[PDB]
Design a protein around this ligand. Structure first.
Ligand SMILES: *[C@@H]1O[C@H](CO)[C@@H](O)[C@H](O)[C@H]1NC(C)=O
Ligand SMILES: [Ca+2]
Ligand SMILES: [Ca+2]
Ligand SMILES: [Ca+2]
Lengths: 65, 298, 299
C-alpha cells in the first residue's frame, strides 16, 4: 500500500471519530443550554439536527469501504 | 481514492461550520446568564411537618408549601401534590423539561438543588412545580419520621403514563451512604427498584437491583461495582446521582434527553445515562416527565 | 473531475489541516461549554425572602433590631412550634403582628373550622396578599404570660378614605372555649366601635344581637353563635358570630364596595361590613387586623 493510500485510511477513522464526537457535543450543548432555562433569564431556543450527522456517517461508511 | 477526497473534504468543511454554529449558540447563552431567572412565591399561611399534615389542616390546593419535619432543622420549601391519589404527597424529585442540571456532585445532592416551584401566569403563589432534588439529608429524615410510602410517576414522549408504588420506603442518613430500602411494590411501570431490569436474567438482572443500594455521584463512588478501574464506575461526569448497583434498571436522575430514544453516539460517555426506567420504555429511552413523591403510611 | 495524482500529496494533507484545526476548536468549544455549565447551576431568584431575626412576636422582634416590614418566624412562649407571620414595622419601633387581611377578594374566606383554626391565604413580604393567620396562632400571641395585647382594625372604602378602631386587652381563648374573642374596652378610633353593637332599627334588641365582645368563633361546620340558625353558614364565612354581626371583616369581597339585598338568593348582608363606619351594604375594599402589646399603643 502506497503511503498516500495509508494516509486516507487514517483520515477516514479520524473523521468518523470527529463525527461521533461532534454528534455528542451537539447533544451535550443542547442539554446543557436547556439546563440554563432554570437558572438564567432565558434559554436559547433551538433544535439540534441529528439527521445531518447520521447522513454524513453513512456517507462515510459507504466511501470508507 | 477517486471520489474519496471529495467526501472527506465535504464533511470536514461541514463540521467546521457546525462548530461555528455551536460556538455562537453558547455565546448567546453566556449572555443570557448575565442575569438570573426569577420567581415570586408568596408563602401559604398553613404549614405542617410534611404535606400530609398540611392537607389534613385544610391545605387542599397543589402548590408550594413550607414544612418543618422537625424543630431541629429550619422550615423549608417543598411542593405538595394535594390532588394525586387523595393528595398529601411531598414531592422530593421532579423532571418535566430540561430546566435543571441533574449531573451534580455529592454535596449538591446532599443539600439539594433545582427549582421547587414557579409562578402560574399572573399569580402571587407558585402553583407549579419546577425541577428539583429535595436533598438526601432531607429525604433521609422524612422517610425516617415513620412508615413512608413512595410514589414514582412517569410519562413517555407519546403522552403515556405509568406509576410505580412502594408501600415502604426509607433512606438512611449520610454516614450510612443514604442507603435505600423499598417494599410492597404495586403499579404499571414495572418494579425496577426491587426486581431489576425485566429484559435480563440471572446475575445480569440481579445486579441492576437498586433496593438495598448506596447512593453515589460521579465524585463519590458507592456503587455495586467493586474494582480498581478508575473508569468502570456507574456515575461519570454530568452523570446524575442515584442508588447505583451494577449499574441500574432505572435512573430518574439521568440526563434529560429531548425526544425520548437516544443512542451511544449521543451519550457523553457512551453509557446510557438518562431518565430511564428499563422495565417500561426499555434501555435507551428517556422519559418526558419523572417524579418522586412520599407520604406517611397508615 | 479527477485531477493530477500529484494533487493528492497536496490535498491529501490539506484535509488534515482542516481536520486537526477542527479538533482544536472542539477543544476550546468544550472548554467554553464548561464555563456555561458553571453559570447554570443556580436556582431562579425568589423575590420573597424571610428575615432571620426571630422572637415571641413582631414586637419582640422589632425590639431585637428588626427595621423593615416582611415575613418573620415567631414563636410565642407556649407555642409548640414557630410559625410564619407578617410583621409591620413603623419608624417608631412598633411591631404589629397582622392576622387578618383583605385587599382584592383573591382569597375565599368561606372555610371550615380546621382551616380557620390553622389559617389560610398567603403571606407576602410586601404585605399585599389576603390571609387569615389562624385562631390557634392568634390565641397563642394574644395570651402570652402577662402581656396585655391590643387590636387595631383598619378599613378602606373604594374612595381612599381609611378608618381605624382600636381595642384594649384584646384576647382569644383556646379551642376549648371556641376561640372566644374578648377585650376590656374600645380604645377609640374613627372607625367606630362596631363590636359593641349597632341598632339597625330592625328589632328592639339589635344592639344585643350584634355585639361581638365575648362571642365565640363560628364556621359553617361548627356553629357557636347566639342564633337559632347558622350565622357562619348564611354569610358563608368564619367569625365571632352573635346574631349575627355589626362588624364582619371576613365577609364576601364585593367588588366596587356597594352591594345590595339583591346580591344573594336570600338577601343576606354578608359582605365586609363594619356598621359604625359604613352602611351594612358597603363592603370594604381593604381590611386589616393587627395586634401588639398594649403597653405600646401610644404611651
Ligand atoms: C450478562 O452480560 C454479559 C455482557 O456484559 C453477557 O455476555 C452475558 O451473556 C449476560 N448474561 C446473560 C443475561 O445471559
Ligand atoms: Ca452537570
Ligand atoms: Ca465502584
Ligand atoms: Ca346557631
Amino acid at each position: 500500500v502506497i503511503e498516500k493510500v495509508q494516509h486516507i485510511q487514517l483520515l477516514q477513522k479520524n473523521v468518523r471519530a470527529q463525527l461521533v464526537d461532534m454528534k455528542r457535543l451537539e447533544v451535550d450543548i443542547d442539554i446543557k443550554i436547556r439546563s440554563c432555562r432554570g437558572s438564567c433569564s432565558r434559554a436559547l431556543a433551538r433544535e439540534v439536527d441529528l439527521k445531518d450527522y447520521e447522513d454524513q456517517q453513512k456517507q462515510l461508511e459507504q466511501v470508507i469501504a | 481514492i477517486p471520489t474519496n477526497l471529495r467526501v472527506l473534504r465535504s464533511i470536514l468543511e461541514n463540521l467546521r461550520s457546525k462548530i461555528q454554529k455551536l460556538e455562537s449558540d453558547v455565546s448567546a447563552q453566556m449572555e443570557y446568564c448575565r442575569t438570573p431567572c426569577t420567581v415570586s412565591c408568596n408563602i401559604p399561611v398553613v404549614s405542617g411537618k410534611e404535606c400530609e399534615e398540611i392537607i389534613r389542616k385544610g391545605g387542599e390546593t397543589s402548590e408550594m408549601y413550607l414544612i418543618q419535619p422537625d424543630s431541629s432543622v429550619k422550615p423549608y420549601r417543598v411542593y405538595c401534590d394535594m390532588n394525586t391519589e387523595n393528595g398529601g404527597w411531598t414531592v422530593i424529585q421532579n423532571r418535566q423539561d430540561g430546566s435543571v442540571d441533574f449531573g451534580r456532585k455529592w454535596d449538591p445532592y446532599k443539600q439539594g438543588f433545582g427549582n421547587v416551584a414557579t409562578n402560574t401566569d399572573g399569580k402571587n403563589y407558585c402553583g407549579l412545580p419546577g425541577e428539583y432534588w429535595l436533598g438526601n439529608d432531607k429525604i433521609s429524615q422524612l422517610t425516617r419520621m415513620g412508615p413512608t410510602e413512595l410514589l414514582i410517576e412517569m410519562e413517555d414522549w407519546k403522552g403515556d403514563k405509568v406509576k410505580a408504588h412502594y408501600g415502604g420506603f426509607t433512606v438512611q442518613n449520610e454516614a450510612n451512604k443514604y442507603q435505600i430500602s423499598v417494599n410492597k411494590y404495586r403499579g404499571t411501570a414495572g418494579n425496577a427498584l426491587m426486581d431489576g431490569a425485566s429484559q435480563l436474567m440471572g446475575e445480569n438482572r440481579t445486579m441492576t437491583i437498586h433496593n438495598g443500594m448506596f447512593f453515589s455521584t460521579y465524585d463519590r463512588d458507592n456503587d455495586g461495582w467493586l474494582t480498581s478501574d478508575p473508569r468502570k464506575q456507574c456515575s461519570k461526569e454530568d452523570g446524575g446521582g442515584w442508588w447505583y448497583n451494577r449499574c441500574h434498571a432505572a435512573n430518574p436522575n439521568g440526563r434529560y434527553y429531548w425526544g425520548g430514544q437516544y443512542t451511544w453516539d449521543m451519550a457523553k460517555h457512551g453509557t446510557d445515562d438518562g431518565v430511564v426506567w428499563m422495565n417500561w420504555k426499555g434501555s435507551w429511552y428517556s422519559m418526558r416527565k419523572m417524579s418522586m413523591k412520599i407520604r406517611p403510611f397508615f | 473531475y479527477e485531477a493530477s495524482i500529484l494533487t493528492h500529496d497536496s490535498s491529501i494533507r490539506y484535509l488534515q489541516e482542516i481536520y486537526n484545526s477542527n479538533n482544536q476548536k472542539i477543544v476550546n468549544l468544550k472548554e467554553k461549554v464548561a464555563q456555561l455549565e458553571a453559570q447554570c447551576q443556580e436556582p431562579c431568584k425568589d423575590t420573597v425572602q424571610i428575615h432571620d431575626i426571630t422572637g415571641k412576636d413582631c414586637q419582640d422582634i422589632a425590639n431585637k433590631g428588626a427595621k423593615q416590614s416582611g415575613l418573620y418566624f415567631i414563636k410565642p412562649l407556649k407555642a409548640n412550634q414557630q410559625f410564619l407571620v407578617y410583621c409591620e414595622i413603623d419608624g417608631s419601633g412598633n411591631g404589629w403582628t397582622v392576622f387578618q387581611k383583605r385587599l382584592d377578594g383573591s382569597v375565599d374566606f368561606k372555610k371550615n373550622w380546621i382551616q380557620y383554626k390553622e389559617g389560610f391565604g398567603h403571606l407576602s413580604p410586601t404585605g399585599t396578599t389576603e390571609f387569615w393567620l389562624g385562631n390557634e396562632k392568634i390565641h397563642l400571641i394574644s395570651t402570652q404570660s402577662a402581656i396585655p395585647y391590643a387590636l387595631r382594625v383598619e378599613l378602606e372604602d373604594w374612595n381612599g378614605r381609611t378608618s381605624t378602631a382600636d381595642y384594649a386587652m384584646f384576647k382569644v381563648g383556646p379551642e376549648a372555649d371556641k376561640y372566644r374573642l374578648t377585650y376590656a374596652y374600645f380604645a377609640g378610633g374613627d372607625a367606630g366601635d362596631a363590636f359593641d353593637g349597632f341598632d339597625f332599627g330592625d328589632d328592639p334588641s339589635d344592639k344585643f344581637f350584634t355585639s361581638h365582645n365575648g362571642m365565640q368563633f363560628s364556621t359553617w361546620d361548627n356553629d357557636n353563635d347566639k342564633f337559632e340558625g347558622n350565622c357562619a353558614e348564611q354569610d358563608g364565612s368564619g367569625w365571632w358570630m352573635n346574631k349575627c354581626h355589626a362588624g364582619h371583616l371576613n365577609g364576601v369581597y364585593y367588588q366596587g364596595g356597594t352591594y345590595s339585598k339583591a346580591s344573594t338568593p336570600n338577601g343576606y348582608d354578608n359582605g365586609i361590613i363594619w356598621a359604625t363606619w359604613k352602611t351594612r351594604w358597603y363592603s370594604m375594599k381593604k381590611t386589616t387586623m393587627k395586634i401588639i402589646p398594649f403597653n405600646r399603643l401610644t404611651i
